[PDB]
């Protein structure tokens, strides 16, 4: 009857809602996890790039000064 | 009263189902973006490894020429 239909509908509404909320929480946990991973890999490769630039400048300074002192010593 | 309760349940169901439809679209969008981010990050990771490969190669090639001179 009418009371029965309303009760049944409320049971469904609550169950479906709580189910959806459980899934939404899992998906937000997943999303923050992925953001964490993305951050870690991005910053790691940022570091690798800074470190490469450091060792690049050290080797460019070491090699591009040997050629200049040869420019002087090939004139002698 | 029965009519009011029924009408409220209609609203609850419609609004809920609408919100769920939107949430699904937004989760599809989120996974899509994650896919893109991953693809670009890994592509530039590979470009960086390959740059380091070719750098060691050229450094070794110019070093051995400088040393034999």
């Amino acid at each position: 009857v009418t009371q029965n239909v309303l009760y049944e509908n409320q049971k469904q509404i609550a169950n479906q809602f709580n189910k959806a909320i459980s899934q939404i929480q899992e998906s937000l946990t997943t999303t923050s996890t992925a953001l964490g991973k993305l951050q870690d890999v991005v910053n790691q490769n940022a570091q690798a790039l800074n470190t490469l630039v450091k060792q690049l400048s050290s080797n460019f300074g070491a090699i591009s000064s040997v050629l200049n002192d040869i420019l002087s010593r090939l004139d002698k | 009263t029965q009519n009011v309760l029924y009408e409220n349940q209609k609203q609850i169901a419609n609004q809920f189902n609408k919100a769920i439809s939107q949430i699904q679209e937004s989760l599809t969008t989120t996974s899509t973006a994650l896919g893109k981010l991953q693809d670009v990050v890994n592509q530039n990771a590979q470009a960086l490894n390959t740059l380091v490969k070719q750098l060691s190669s050229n450094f070794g090639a110019i070093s051995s020429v400088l040393n034999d001179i």
């Binding site: 509908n9 469904q12 509404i13 479906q16 809602f17 189910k19 959806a20 899934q23 939404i24 899992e26 998906s27 997943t30 999303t31 996890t33 992925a34 991973k37 993305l38 890999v41 790691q44 490769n45 690798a48 470190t51 490469l52 060792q55 | 349940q9 209609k10 609850i12 169901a13 809920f16 189902n17 769920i20 949430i23 699904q24 989760l27 599809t28 989120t30 996974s31 994650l34 896919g35 991953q38 990050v41 890994n42 990771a45 960086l48 490894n49 380091v52």
Partner: peptide
């Protein structure tokens, strides 16, 4: 120098699952 790779395929799978289980949560009144 260490570069690293990203693999969030598991995460994306878990999202696809979430979306598919939200399809089961609609209300047939």
């Amino acid at each position: 120098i260490n570069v690293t790779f990203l693999d969030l395929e598991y995460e994306m799978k878990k999202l696809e699952e979430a979306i598919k289980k939200l399809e089961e949560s609609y209300i047939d009144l």
